[PDB]
Amino acid sequence: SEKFAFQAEVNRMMKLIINSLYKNKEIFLRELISNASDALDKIRLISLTDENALAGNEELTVKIKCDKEKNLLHVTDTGVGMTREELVKNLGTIAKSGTSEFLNKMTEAQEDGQSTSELIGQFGVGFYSAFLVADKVIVTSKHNNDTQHIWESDSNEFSVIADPRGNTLGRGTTITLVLKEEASDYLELDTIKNLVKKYSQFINFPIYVWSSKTEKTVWDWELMN
Ligand SMILES: CCCNC(=O)[C@H]1O[C@@H](n2cnc3c(N)ncnc32)[C@H](O)[C@@H]1O
């Protein structure tokens, strides 16, 4: 277990994003789904050049799960996943060149009254908007080139640890949101299914929500797109 501070610019970026989307919190789920989609594209593109790419997990899905009792929301993809060093660098620092650009266009647009939600989506920085609804964000990731690890943060710092549960994802990433008290509605299946549907019509991968039929109850993955 290693402890880390966020880079200064990521602290600023977190605040810009939270402020930009404060009255549209639900866009957090849009961005998590987009990130999962990009991750599935990446492994799909890798499988064109590497016969083993999918060996760790033969599926390509996004699977969402509400856990009312533990107050958790889980967004799981079987995409490319992240190595330990990518968990640290990609989430904890300004890692790409596009991210800096985003910082400039965001502040210029935000002073000029121009729309910013598109900026967040364009540059793929929406991960941080999970903090509008969660007190704790947890990222479990398994990448073909590393062992499974857990990233966790309350936004005031983050830590990364080897997952003691070993390789349970096979390949891919689970974003786990410890929801704020004011965000318990994101644990309701009807809420989540409408949002998931709303945000997944463009995803070139199937997206499922763990749902109940129903005194007899049957739970199963329900395709959303
Ligand atoms: C740039 C703003 C924060 N950085 C990310 O979201 C990056 O983290 C990684 N990331 C986030 N969610 C991911 C996922 N589900 N699978 C793989 N990488 C992911 C991607 O490299 C994103 O560019």
CATH, domain 1-225, list 1.10.1040.10, 3.30.565.10, 3.40.309.10, 1.10.3260.10? 3.30.565.10
Q: What is the DSSP letter of 25?
A: T
**How far is 172 from 76, CA to CA, in rounded Å?**
7
The single residue listed with the structure tokens 């990433």 is: 173
Helices (H), the chain: 8-20, 27-46, 84-92, 97-111, 117-123, 189-199
**How far is 92 from 7, CA to CA, in rounded Å?**
6
Contact assessment for residue 133 and residue 181, using Cβ atoms and an 8 Å cutoff: no
For the chain, the farthest-separated pair of C-alpha atoms sits apart, in whole angstroms, at 57
Burial 104-119 (b: 16+ CB within 10 A, else e): eebeeeeeeeeebbeb
- Distance from residue 112's CA to the centre of ligand 1 (Å): 28
User: Closest by alpha carbon to 64, among 47, 77, 49?
Assistant: 77
Q: What is the dihedral sign for C-alpha 69, 75, 76, 82? A: negative
Q: Residue 196: count other Cβ atoms within 10 Å of its Cβ.
A: 22
Which of helix, strand or coil describes residue 186?
helix
Query: Which residue's alpha carbon is at the smallest distance from atom 22 of ligand 1?
Result: 90
**How far is 149 from 68, CA to CA, in rounded Å?**
25
Helix or strand run (H / E) with residue 179: strand 172-179
- Distance from residue 35's CA to the centre of ligand 1 (Å): 6
Q: What is the DSSP letter of 5?
A: P
For residue 135, give every residue at least 6 positions away whose Cβ sits within 8 Å of its Cβ, in sequence order, or none. 154, 178, 179, 180
Which of helix, strand or coil describes residue 184?
helix
Structure tokens belonging to residue 96: 């790409």
Tell whether ligand 1 has an atom less than 6 A from the beta carbon of residue 35: yes
Cite the annotated binding site for ATP by residue number: 35, 77, 90, 127
Contact assessment for residue 180 and residue 135, using Cβ atoms and an 8 Å cutoff: yes
Residues in the chain, how many? Answer: 225
**How far is 156 from 200, CA to CA, in rounded Å?**
31
Helix or strand run (H / E) with residue 75: strand 72-77
Residue 108 CA, distance from chain mean position: 26
**How far is 12 from 24, CA to CA, in rounded Å?**
19
User: Closest by alpha carbon to 177, among 142, 211, 152?
Assistant: 152
The CA-atom distances, in angstroms, between 116 and each of 85, 110, 111, 138 are: 30, 7, 11, 26
Q: DSSP string covering 44-70, please?
A: HHHTTT-TTTTTT-----EEEEEETTT
| Ligand 1 atom closest to Cα of residue 102 | 1
Structure tokens belonging to residue 190: 């009807």
Burial 25-50 (b: 16+ CB within 10 A, else e): bbbbbbbbbbbbbebbbebbeeeeee
Query: Which residue's alpha carbon is at the smallest distance from atom 20 of ligand 1?
Result: 90
Tell whether ligand 1 has an atom less than 6 A from the beta carbon of residue 82: yes
Cite the annotated binding site by residue number: 35, 77, 90, 127
- Distance from residue 92's CA to the centre of ligand 1 (Å): 11
Q: What is the DSSP letter of 74?
A: E
